[PDB]
């Protein structure tokens, strides 16, 4: 599924990502717009072989489980491919582990390049939140 920025929005705000380890919701809005446009079927290869899943991109070295990236983790407790199902419940609730884990948001590289200190309200600028 590709979202739209508001139809995003309020699904992660209604999912309590917004405000999340105080991460305001355009923080969240603007991470997905440059790891996977918008959309949950993104995936991409890294260069250990592990992979990056759905919306926020989310890691198979430490977060899920594809069973083919040998010597990682499953910290978020399932497969892969659930991170990219249209219903992006399994994507919130992994990224709030993945932001609690001590580094907040700079876990997420496109977020740290391209959204941190930026005017991230902007991505929810005209959305009936
Ligand atoms: C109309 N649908 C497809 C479904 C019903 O909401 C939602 C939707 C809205 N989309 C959209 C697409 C775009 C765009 O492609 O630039 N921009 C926005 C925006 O708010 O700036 C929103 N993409 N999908
Ligand atoms: C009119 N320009 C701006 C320039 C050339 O005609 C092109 C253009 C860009 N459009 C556009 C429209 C929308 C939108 O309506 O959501 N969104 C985007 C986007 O990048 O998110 C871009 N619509 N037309
Ligand atoms: C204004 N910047 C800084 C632009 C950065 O790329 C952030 C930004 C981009 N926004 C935006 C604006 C629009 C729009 O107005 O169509 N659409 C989208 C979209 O993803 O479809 C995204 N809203 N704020
Ligand atoms: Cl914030
Ligand atoms: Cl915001
Ligand atoms: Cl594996
Ligand atoms: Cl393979
Ligand atoms: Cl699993
Ligand atoms: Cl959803
Ligand atoms: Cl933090
Ligand atoms: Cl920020
Ligand atoms: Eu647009
Ligand atoms: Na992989
Ligand atoms: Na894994």
Not at 17 to 22: A, H, K, V
């Amino acid at each position: 599924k590709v979202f739209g920025r508001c139809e995003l929005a309020a699904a992660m705000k209604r999912h309590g990502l917004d405000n999340y380890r105080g991460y305001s919701l355009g923080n969240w809005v603007c991470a997905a717009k440059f790891e996977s446009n918008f959309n949950t079927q993104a995936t991409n290869r890294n260069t250990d072989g592990s992979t990056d899943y759905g919306i926020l991109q989310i890691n198979s070295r430490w977060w899920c489980n594809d069973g083919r990236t040998p010597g990682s983790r499953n910290l978020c407790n399932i497969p892969c491919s659930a991170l990219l199902s249209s219903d992006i419940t399994a994507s919130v609730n992994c990224a709030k582990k993945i932001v609690s884990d001590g580094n907040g948001m700079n876990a997420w590289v496109a977020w740290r390049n391209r959204c941190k200190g930026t005017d991230v309200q902007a991505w929810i600028r005209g959305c009936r939140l």
